[PDB]
């Protein structure tokens, strides 16, 4: 079990750790989060009480270093940093744990929600999408744009998701125009899976990361990416059966976790109705279709 | 974006453009089978591709053999149309290629856009105009070449005959659309109007009769009457 220690909490803030959130009051004696499960990536995210606009946060893996948060009063945000002095870090964390100044990651024993949301997400792939090579953790906020959003403005602060564009020469083989546009299997299996992602685990990892960025930060570019990756699979007549089964599980847990009051913005009516009711895979996503129909039948 | 009444003079500027109409590509007769079911039999069709400034009509004849063994023919027709337009553009010198292609039905946008990915500088546009190009198969000489074709074939026409010698493109297109609207609303009356005078012939190398300026005004007025008439016989006004 790992720990993220905080130098202090000088400004009132709502703190999020994966799907959990809590409030810290201005100058409250708060020194971080303990009992964080090893073996998964994590995200620690923030929403200032005084300017609810721009959520921001950090993806990290406690196996890759000792990380802590300290507020920066010049830049006005909680920053993640890496302490290279291990003995110093363990001593600090022990002092705060003895004074009981830390909250406890309250994972219920029965509960596989976070695993199920992050099964294919790996820090090394996150760091290729979020380019900031000097740190082992990755900063994301609400306003960051994607490489494709910049094609349609700072490239260093972009999200480098894989560009998916259904009306593009990458997607359409000369002389197979109708075929490839109406059945995207070539683009899914040959271009994207074999060519770019190499395997379906890397594809699912980017899909899950995009959803989580979209839901935690309200990142428009991430939502566009998540939906495009779903739609590419649903619009392919030929998909390996293990990918369809896993996709159904992935989407099931994303829909289950989505806060009901943000479905309006996080779910694209056209993509989902197409995917569940018109596409090649309309009959292949039994779990996802059942939860969507029972939870969000308005959208449909 | 979409082409409408507010940008109508754009058609006659010096940027090369083509209208594409696919409404006569896939044509069928519906009939009863010996067992009392219903079947379709295709007949020859055509793509209607028109430069509104010059009158140049690229008429691609769609022979029924192109549907043999194919499924979902109405969807295939839009892609076949897009493939043939793309081939036509590629066959033209660069200086003759269009800067814009305006499709008369929105379902042609994605097929044509996909077939023209090689041409990112060519704008593919819909229109809010309800243009009567479906009635092209009421022009006797065009119907004749389509129904006689025994193989795929491209035929080139000037749909304005020699009118541009005397009138502007804007006026020629207005006349053409008035004639085609009339032929669409009541083909027999429209054709009677156009031929009622045996002394006004259609030249071998033309589609329409050799009307004088004065007679064209008469004709145009009678065609407007017909369109208004039929609009009363239709809505009881
Ligand atoms: O006075 C040493 C401050 N170094 C920064 C820091 C390192 C580890 C944990 C925390 Br909390 C803060
Ligand atoms: O508003 C929900 C309150 N969440 C409970 C909670 C409290 C303290 C720490 C963590 Br982590 C979670
Ligand atoms: O009406 C578009 C306003 N942009 C906010 C937004 C839209 C959809 C998803 C996410 Br996440 C964020």
SS3 per residue for A150-165: HHCCCHHHCECCCCCC
Domain span(s) for CATH 3.30.420.230 in chain B: 9-163
Q: Which ligand is nearest to the CA of A16?
A: 2
Counting ligands in written order, the one closest to the CA of A68 is 1
DSSP state of B10: G
* Phi, psi dihedral angles at A186 (to 5 degrees): -60, -50
- CB neighbours of B148 closer than 8 A, spacing ≥ 6? none
Domain with CATH 1.20.80.40 in chain B: 164-237
The atom of ligand 1 lying closest to the CA of A93 is 9
| B181 interface with A at CB cutoff 8 Å | no
Q: How far apart are the C-alpha atoms of A88 and A91, rounded to whole Å?
A: 5
Residues 6+ apart with CB under 8 A from B149: B44, B61, B63
Counting from 1 in the atom list of ligand 3, the atom nearest the Cα of A224 is 9
Residue of A nearest to B77 (CA): A178
What is the rounded CA–CA span in Å between residue A228 and residue A212? 15
Long-range pairs, A211-215, Cβ under 8 A, ≥24: A211/A117, A211/A254, A212/A43, A212/A117, A212/A118, A212/A121, A213/A140, A213/A159, A214/A266, A215/A254, A215/A257, A215/A258, A215/A259, A215/A262, A215/A266
Q: Which chain A residues are within 8 Å of B83, Cβ to Cβ?
A: 177
| Cβ neighbours around A11 below 10 Å, total | 19
Q: Decide: A52 and A16 in contact? Cβ < 8 Å.
A: no
Question: What is the widest separation between alpha-carbon atoms in chain A?
Answer: 71
CATH number of the domain encompassing residue A273: 1.25.40.550
Q: Which of B40, B65, B51, B49 is nearest to B17 (CA)?
A: B51
Least Cα separation, residue B112 to chain A (angstroms): 10
Backbone angles phi, psi at B49, to 5 degrees: -120, 115
Give the closest of A167, A169, A178 to B113, CB-based: A167
The resolution of the experimental structure, rounded to one decimal in Å, is 1.6
The conformational region for residue A209 under phi > 0 = left, psi -120 to 50 = alpha, else beta, is alpha
Which technique was the structure solved with, according to the deposited record?
A: X-ray
Closest Cα to atom 8, ligand 2: which residue?
A22
Distance, in Å, from the CA atom of B194 to the CA atom of B186, rounded to the nearest integer, reads: 12
What domain range is A209 assigned to? 116-299
d(CA B174, CA B164): 12
Distance from CA of A1 to the nearest CA of B (A): 53
> If you measure from the C-alpha of residue A218 to the centroid of ligand 3, how many angstroms do you get, rounded to a whole number?
7
CB B20 within 8 A of CB B49: yes
Task: Tell me whether A187 touches chain B (CB under 8 Å).
Answer: no
Second-level CATH architecture of B164-237: Up-down Bundle (1.20)
Contact B99, B121 (CB under 8 A): yes
- Contact assessment for residue B154 and residue B60, using Cβ atoms and an 8 Å cutoff: yes
> A-chain residues within 8 Å CB-CB of B110?
167, 181
Give SS3 for B20.
Answer: strand
Q: In a 3-state reduction of DSSP, which class is residue B200?
A: coil
Least Cα distance to A177 among B211, B156, B80 occurs for B80
Residues of A in contact with B111 (CB under 8 A): 177-178
B194: left (phi over 0), alpha (psi -120 to 50) or beta: alpha
The alpha carbon of residue B16 and the mean position of all alpha carbons in its chain are separated, in whole angstroms, by 18
Ligand 1, residues A92, A94, A101: which to mutate, most atoms within 8 A of Cβ? A92
Q: Is A3 exposed, middle or buried (0-12, 13-18, 19+ CB in 10 A)?
A: buried
Of the candidate CATH numbers 3.40.309.10, 3.40.50.1240, 3.20.20.70, 3.30.420.230, the domain formed by B9-163 belongs to 3.30.420.230
Cα–Cα distance measured from residue B109 to residue B124, given in angstroms and rounded to the nearest whole number: 7
A 10 A CB-CB count for B97 gives 17
């Amino acid at each position: 079990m790992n720990t993220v220690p905080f130098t202090s909490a000088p400004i009132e803030v709502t703190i999020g750790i994966d799907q959990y959130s809590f409030n810290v009051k201005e100058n409250q004696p708060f020194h971080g989060i303990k009992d964080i499960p090893i073996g998964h990536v994590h995200v620690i995210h923030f929403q200032h009480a005084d300017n609810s606009s721009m959520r921001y946060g950090y993806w990290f893996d406690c196996r890759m270093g000792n990380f802590y948060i300290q507020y920066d009063p010049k830049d006005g945000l909680y920053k993640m940093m890496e302490e290279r002095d291990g003995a110093k870090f363990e001593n600090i964390v022990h002092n705060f744990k003895e004074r009981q100044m830390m909250v406890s990651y309250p994972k219920i024993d029965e509960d596989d929600t976070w695993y199920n949301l992050t099964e294919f997400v790996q820090m090394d792939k996150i760091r290729k999408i979020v380019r900031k090579d000097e740190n082992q953790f990755s900063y994301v906020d609400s306003s960051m744009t994607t490489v494709q959003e910049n094609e349609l403005s700072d490239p260093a602060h972009s999200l480098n998701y894989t560009v998916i564009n259904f009306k593009s020469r990458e997607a359409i083989r000369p002389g197979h125009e109708m075929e490839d546009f109406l059945d995207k299997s070539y683009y899914l299996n040959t271009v994207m899976l074999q060519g770019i992602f190499k395997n379906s685990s890397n594809y699912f990892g980017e899909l899950q990361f995009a959803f989580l960025n979209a839901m935690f930060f309200g990142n428009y570019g991430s939502s566009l990416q998540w939906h495009a990756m779903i739609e590419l699979i649903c619009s392919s007549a030929t998909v390996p059966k293990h990918m369809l089964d896993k996709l159904d599980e992935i989407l099931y847990y994303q829909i289950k976790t989505l806060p009901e009051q943000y479905s309006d913005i996080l779910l694209n009516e056209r993509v989902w109705n197409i995917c569940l009711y018109s596409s090649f895979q309309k009959n292949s996503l039994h779990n996802t279709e059942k939860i969507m129909e029972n939870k969000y039948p308005e959208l449909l | 974006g979409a082409m409408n009444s507010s940008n109508y003079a754009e058609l006659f500027n010096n940027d090369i453009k083509l209208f594409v109409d696919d409404t006569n590509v896939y044509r069928v007769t519906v009939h009863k089978t010996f067992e009392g079911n219903v079947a379709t039999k295709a007949i020859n069709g055509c793509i209607f591709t028109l430069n509104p400034k010059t009158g140049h009509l690229f008429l691609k004849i769609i022979h029924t053999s192109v549907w043999a063994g194919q499924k979902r023919l109405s969807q295939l027709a839009k892609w076949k149309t897009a493939e043939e337009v793309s081939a036509l553009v590629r066959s033209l010198p660069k200086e003759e290629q269009p800067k814009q292609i305006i499709v008369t039905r929105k379902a042609m946008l994605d097929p044509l856009e996909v077939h023209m990915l090689d041409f990112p500088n060519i704008a593919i546009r819909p229109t809010e105009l309800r243009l009567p190009f479906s009635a092209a198969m009421s022009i006797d000489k065009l119907s004749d070449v389509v129904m006689k074709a025994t193989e795929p074939q491209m035929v080139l026409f000037n749909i304005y005959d020699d009118w541009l010698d005397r009138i502007s493109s804007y006026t020629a297109f207005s006349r053409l659309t008035l004639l085609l609207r009339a032929l669409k609303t009541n083909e027999e009356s429209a054709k009677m109007i156009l031929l009622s005078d045996p002394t006004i012939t259609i030249k071998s190398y033309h589609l329409w009769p050799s009307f004088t300026d004065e007679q064209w005004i008469t004709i145009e007025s009678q065609m407007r009457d017909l369109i208004l008439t039929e609009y009363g016989r239709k809505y009881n006004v």
